[PDB]
RNA sequence: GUUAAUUCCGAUAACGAACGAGACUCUGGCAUGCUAACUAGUUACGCGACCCCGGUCGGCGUAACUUCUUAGAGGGACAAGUGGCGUUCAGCCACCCGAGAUUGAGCAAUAACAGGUCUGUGAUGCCCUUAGAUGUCCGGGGCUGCACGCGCGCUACACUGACUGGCUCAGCGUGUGCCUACCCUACGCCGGCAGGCGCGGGUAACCCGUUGAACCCCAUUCGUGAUGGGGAUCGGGGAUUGCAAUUAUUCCCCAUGAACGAGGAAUUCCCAGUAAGUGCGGGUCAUAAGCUUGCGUUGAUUAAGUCCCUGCCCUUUGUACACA
């Protein structure tokens, strides 16, 4: 049951929309820049949204985003 | 203390005191707009403050 | 129900059967001795450690419950 | 030692009760009433008996040497507390009862507490639980 | 009761809150006990921020 | 060379009893052949030298940890009292069947009473125990 | 000469084992008593299997005295199981080459992973309304 | 009737009203030409060989 | 000299604040100090029924209260430790003074 | 013996299975070999990861049963190590060849259940599981109320199931179950 | 379609949101990294004792250090990487690295039930009672009473067992009271025991306590017999509690030794340290666990699915129901 919710996905889409330049295709690099630009009060939620950001990275690399 | 109470029982008993004073002043200051207390107990004295809405009554 | 009567000490024929049939048995436990010559398991242990005292059988594993003895070395 | 010897007592009538000789002595003299496994291993202890023997191996006179131990426990250093007939109500002695005296002494006190009209008393005559049980739910086998 | 509840609920929202919630229940002009319930604004109910966001009375 | 801790204890508990049996100065109580050894069980031991066992089998604990008295010894000889129709529980040993052991082993100089309560074990018995254990290790060899 | 020390834990369910390496003989004893008589002898060469996967050739140089505390029987023997192998590879981190360490740690890896990694399986807490953590009391319909 | 051996090519679905029989298409290892769908009771791995008692058994499975 | 200041409360970060304040007040006046020793905390547990009556489903509360125990060791006579101990304590914390 | 391994006192090599179907499901050989079949556990977490567990560990897990034997695994590895010498004294070879022969015999190749019962083939994992489970039962039914102990019970049930003697309590219900399976098809 | 989930994707007169879920909080697991510790230890060293240079020691004392011990700030896991299936979406599965690739709970919306509680209360309406009391106190009994039925449970039906020795391994805790008069106990003697008498320690990581727990384990004794399995009824004796034990308060000693040979119809709980076996704390407690709430020890069989049964929800449909 590892479906991440809209609370993850809204913030992840906003981060990847405003900050497509400073992000990379691996989790640990853009893990600490999303907490740099965005205030995430829970480190578990921080680790969720950066993972979904890294998941949207290769979709943008492969082709057109939503 | 000379009776030398335990420290589990001391932290239970002063919390009982904090409950009983808060409850007694809910009883007493009801029409006076009571809101709360907290009990800053020090050595050599116990500071006890009330906090309420209407004060001169 | 079923009423079996094991021997409590040996008969002369049963001690003869001990002398003639136990060492060539590949499996030597007091349980199989108790079912093959109708004896209590306690002196099936006690009468068969006599056979180790006179050296006709060989221990492999000794236990509070399962003492297991073997044949003689036939070669 | 291994074979059944001559004079192998299959049967015995000690204190006028039966015992098979196919059993060990220490757990065979438990089959008389009034001697269990605890008191048996003391009356065979005060007698010099190698207690690996079954009840058919032992010879003819120590089977009465063991008898006198029970009728005279204070002759043979068996203490006050180890008995079962301790501090009697009428003569106040410490004794040991054996296989025909137990059911007699069970009369000897229960008709006494019957005829004294005690609450302890009437329950035995009724056939009811005595020591304070709850017979509302348990004990339905005896009556109907 | 219904006018007093709005006279409280407008005040404790114009004094600044994300949302409040006021219940009144019991026997009142009759015998059958009814409970009407007054809300507005946001209100969380589960988890740890119940400890320090809402205050019950 | 050898010591007490380097050898199988299951065989060592027979040799420590045998060395006390060969000495035979242990101040045996008269009630050793009739007594029940604790509350948790009912039946007497099968062997006839249980006190000769339990004396030096108590003394070997007094090399591992001293300052341990009759409460520690009625603890370490506790067992599962089966209460019959109710669930079983842990219960102690008899106090006197360890107290006579301690009074015996302070009589014949193997242990002695010590500060912080209990018994410690004397250097004489400390020599004696691994003197036995060297013989046990030679039996192993 | 130099005190070549490494002092390495090992945890089964509750039991914690503290192995401690020095250079020396093949002295491997747990809490001051040697290995081959440790309760029970039912699984004695289970406790000997880190020696038997390695031989005496590497245990010859290092003598290890192992403390153990807590847990049960199987917990203590599985604690001193992995504590001595983790202590061996932790000594072989520093005082021999790591290209001597790898060829013996991957023996343990290819044999059984629990020989050097911990077991986080712990006792799940009992809940109200049950005799156990998952089991519930009997429910009486009608 | 000989005892035949076969290998799974695909695991498809569960049948049984209680959901207990993994219906699976398999092909034989001596005759790898054609393939038949049979019910298998128990855990069925992909990449698995199994003993079939006959090749005349088949049913309809939705 | 060998003065013990043991502090207790059931709020963690409040006593973590005031013990660090006592450490800073010790460092500022050139005193030798041992670190704050974290004693194994008491977790006082009470499990009662939820229901005021007795019929329902058998559900139980699980109330905890964690009281904490930290201590500071200093080496000075008492003209230095008392004023820094007296200043800046916040309401849950309770300190003590032990000469030994 | 650092590289080659002794199965307790036994050969772990030179035992060749005859069943193609349960090759990776059987577990004795070259990495599956273990000194005693007591272990830490973990093999009951995923679905097919219980097949990476040796048969001696599976039997030492399985044949403890009926409440009083729950949580007694060193107590029963004692029993199976006592039974190993009984196998050696009876048939005269490495007991794990006898064990895998008993598995391939006693494991029912096809059964019948509901989709009225229709014949359904079994899984090889469930076949070795049910082989072990039926070998548990005869070792216990004979040892109940008897002087003839489990050290002979799991011995001779295994020995009879090695050749399929139609006497082992596993083998008789093996004879029942696929017979009624081919009946109701 | 997918997920534990109105959890998301995706179709689309809807778009953007809120509550619930999730998020959060506590706990479990790993970090040879930080801060540390005479009430926690470890390694060395100096002694002591014993063994034939070395070994052992919870035998003593002290130069480092925090590995084990305690608990703070931090970190660590996100379906992250690979390979399949899939709108190539949301996601699922396997593998790699890994301490973890589904730890367990707490909290838990809209509402409803004439569910329960006036015997939790100085929360309360109304009624009854109120001096010969339905107030209060004291004495005695009762709440236990037993042809029967039902439910929650405990012990067994044995040999995988029982008995008797010995080996030997825990964690949650708790412990001197406003009233309150009642603690956990070391050790030494008396006694087989329950217990008694002395001195001590502990208001507590200090003392109990290295909490030497069982099951298990090592060796005995019995032999398929209602047997030493089983331990109900009952007889006698001795202690403790209290003001008082009789309807035996509870314990101890001996004896007596019942049914019970694996339980029909039916039915409960459960998938990982899980069930189950096993014992220990806490509550109630002067006396005290076949209960309950927690804790630890040992530790699996089976399965990764479905709507067959039983429930519950949602869509469609009918309604003359709407206190439904
Ligand atoms: Mg929320
Ligand atoms: Mg939640
Ligand atoms: Mg006891
Ligand atoms: Mg009132
Ligand atoms: Mg009154
Ligand atoms: Mg009154
Ligand atoms: Mg009724
Ligand atoms: Mg009933
Ligand atoms: Mg009885
Ligand atoms: Mg009876
Ligand atoms: Mg019977
Ligand atoms: Mg049912
Ligand atoms: Mg119609």
């Amino acid at each position: 049951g590892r479906v991440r919710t809209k609370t993850v996905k809204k913030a992840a889409r906003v981060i990847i929309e405003k900050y497509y330049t400073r992000l990379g295709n691996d989790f640990h690099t853009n893990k600490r820049v999303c907490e740099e630009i965005a205030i995430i009060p829970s480190k578990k939620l921080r680790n969720k949204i950066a993972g979904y950001v890294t998941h949207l990275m290769k979709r943008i690399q492969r082709g057109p985003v939503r | 203390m000379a009776v030398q109470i335990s420290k589990k029982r001391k932290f239970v008993a002063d919390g009982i005191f904090k409950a009983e004073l808060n409850e007694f002043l809910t009883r007493e200051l009801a029409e006076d707009g009571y809101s709360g207390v907290e009990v800053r107990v020090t050595p050599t004295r116990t500071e006890i403050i009330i906090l309420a809405t209407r004060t001169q009554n | 129900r079923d009423k079996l009567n094991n021997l409590v000490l040996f008969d002369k024929a049963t001690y003869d059967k001990l002398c003639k049939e136990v060492p060539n048995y590949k499996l030597i436990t007091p349980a199989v001795v108790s079912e093959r010559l109708k004896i209590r398991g306690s002196l099936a242990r006690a009468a068969l450690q006599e056979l180790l005292s006179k050296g006709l059988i060989k221990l492999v594993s000794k236990h509070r419950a399962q003492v297991i003895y073997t044949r003689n070395t036939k070669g | 030692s291994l074979v059944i010897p001559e004079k192998f007592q299959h049967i015995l009538r000690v204190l006028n009760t039966n015992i098979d000789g196919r059993r060990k002595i220490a757990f065979a003299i438990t089959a008389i009433k009034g001697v269990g496994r605890r008191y048996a291993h003391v009356v065979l202890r005060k007698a010099d008996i190698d207690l690996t023997k079954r009840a058919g191996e032992l010879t003819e006179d120590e089977v009465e040497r063991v008898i006198t131990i029970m009728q005279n426990p204070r002759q043979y250093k068996i203490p006050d507390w180890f008995l079962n007939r301790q501090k009697d109500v009428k003569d106040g002695k410490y004794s040991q009862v054996l296989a025909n005296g137990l059911d007699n002494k069970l009369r000897e006190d229960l008709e006494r507490l019957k005829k004294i009209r005690a609450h302890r008393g009437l329950r035995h005559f009724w056939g009811l639980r005595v020591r304070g049980q709850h017979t509302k739910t348990t004990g339905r086998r005896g009556r109907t | 009761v219904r006018r007093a509840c709005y006279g409280v609920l407008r005040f404790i929202m114009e004094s600044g809150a994300k949302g409040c919630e006021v219940v009144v229940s019991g026997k009142l002009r009759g015998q059958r006990a009814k409970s009407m319930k007054f809300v507005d604004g946001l209100m969380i109910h589960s988890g740890d921020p119940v400890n320090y966001y809402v205050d019950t009375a | 060379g050898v010591t007490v801790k380097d050898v199988n204890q299951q065989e060592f508990v027979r040799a420590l009893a045998a060395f006390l049996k060969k000495s035979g100065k242990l101040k045996v109580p008269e009630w050793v052949d009739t007594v029940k050894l604790a509350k948790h069980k009912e039946l007497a031991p099968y062997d006839e030298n249980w006190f000769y066992t339990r004396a030096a089998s108590t003394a070997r604990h007094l090399y591992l940890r001293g300052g341990a008295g009759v409460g520690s010894m009625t603890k370490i000889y506790g067992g599962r009292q089966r209460n019959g129709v109710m669930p079983s529980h842990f219960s102690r040993g008899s106090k006197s069947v360890a107290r006579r052991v301690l009074q015996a082993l302070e009589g014949l100089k193997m242990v002695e009473k010590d500060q912080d309560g209990g018994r410690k074990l004397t250097p004489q018995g400390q020599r004696d125990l691994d003197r036995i254990a060297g013989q046990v290790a030679a039996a192993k060899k | 000469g130099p005190l070549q020390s490494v002092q390495v834990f090992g945890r089964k369910k509750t039991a914690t084992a503290v192995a401690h390496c020095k250079r020396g003989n093949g002295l491997i004893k747990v809490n001051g008593r040697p290995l081959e008589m440790i309760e029970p002898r039912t699984l004695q060469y289970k406790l000997l299997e880190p020696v038997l996967l390695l031989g005496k050739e590497r245990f010859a140089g290092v003598d290890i005295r192992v403390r153990v505390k807590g847990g049960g029987h199987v917990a203590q023997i599985y604690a001193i199981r992995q504590s001595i192998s983790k202590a061996l590879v932790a000594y072989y981190q520093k005082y021999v080459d790591e290209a001597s360490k790898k060829e013996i740690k991957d023996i343990l890896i290819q044999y059984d992973r629990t020989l050097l990694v911990a077991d986080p399986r712990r006792c799940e807490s009992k809940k109200f309304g049950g005799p156990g953590a998952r089991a519930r009391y009997q429910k009486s319909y009608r | 009737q000989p005892i035949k051996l076969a290998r799974v090519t695909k695991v498809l679905g569960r049948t049984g009203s209680q959901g207990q029989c993994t219906q699976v298409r398999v092909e034989f290892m001596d005759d790898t030409s054609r393939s038949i769908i049979r019910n298998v009771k128990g855990p069925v791995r992909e990449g698995d060989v199994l003993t079939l008692l006959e090749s005349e058994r088949e049913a309809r499975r939705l | 000299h060998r003065i013990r200041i043991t502090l207790t409360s059931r709020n963690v970060k409040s006593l973590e604040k005031v013990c660090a304040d006592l450490i800073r007040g010790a460092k500022e006046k050139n005193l030798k100090v041992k670190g704050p020793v974290r004693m194994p905390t008491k977790t006082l547990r009470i499990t009662t029924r939820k229901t005021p009556c007795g019929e329902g489903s058998k559900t139980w509360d699980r109330f905890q209260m964690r009281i904490h125990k930290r201590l500071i060791d200093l080496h000075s006579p008492s003209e230095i430790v008392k004023q820094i101990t007296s200043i800046s304590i916040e309401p849950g914390v309770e300190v003590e003074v032990t000469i030994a | 013996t650092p590289d080659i391994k002794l199965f307790g006192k036994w050969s772990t090599d030179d035992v060749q299975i005859n069943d193609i179907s349960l090759q990776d499901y059987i577990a004795v050989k070259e990495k599956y070999a273990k000194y005693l079949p007591h272990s830490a556990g973990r093999y009951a977490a995923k679905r097919f990861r219980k097949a990476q567990c040796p048969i001696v560990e599976r039997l030492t897990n399985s044949m403890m049963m009926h409440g009083r034997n729950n949580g007694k695994k060193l107590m029963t590895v004692r029993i199976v190590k006592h039974a190993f010498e009984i196998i050696h004294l009876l048939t005269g070879e490495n007991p794990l060849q006898v064990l895998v022969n008993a598995i391939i015999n006693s494991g029912p190749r096809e059964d019948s259940t509901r989709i009225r019962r229709q014949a359904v083939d079994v899984s090889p994992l469930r076949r070795v599981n049910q082989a072990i489970w039926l070998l548990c039962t005869g070792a216990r039914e004979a040892a109940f109320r008897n002087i003839k102990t489990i050290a002979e019970c799991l011995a001779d049930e295994l020995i009879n199931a090695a050749k399929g003697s139609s006497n082992s309590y596993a083998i008789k219900k093996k004879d029942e179950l696929e017979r009624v399976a081919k009946s109701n098809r």
Side-chain angles (χ1 to χ4, degrees), chain I residues 85-96:
Chain I
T85 302
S86 67
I87 61 97
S88 179
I89 55 97
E90 53 187 355
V93 76
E94 185 179 3
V95 298
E96 64 92 18

Side-chain angles (χ1 to χ4, degrees), chain E residues 44-47:
Chain E
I44 52 97
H45 297 92
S46 66

Side-chain angles (χ1 to χ4, degrees), chain H residues 4-60:
Chain H
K4 274 78 67 179
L5 295 172
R7 183 177 293 174
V8 57
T9 180
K10 57 177 73 66
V11 289
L12 292 83
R14 304 292 298 272
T15 55
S17 296
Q18 292 165 347
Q20 63 181 357
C21 296
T22 309
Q23 54 91 23
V24 163
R25 189 188 292 272
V26 297
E27 74 276 13
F28 295 101
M29 289 183 283
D30 56 355
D31 190 2
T32 181
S33 177
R34 61 105 189 84
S35 184
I36 195 64
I37 306 100
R38 300 180 79 258
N39 283 325
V40 183
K41 190 257 285 182
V44 182
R45 192 182 293 174
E46 178 66 29
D48 180 79
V49 289
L50 72 158
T51 298
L52 307 189
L53 268 296
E54 72 269 15
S55 67
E56 292 86 3
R57 182 260 180 89
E58 71 269 11
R60 56 103 191 88

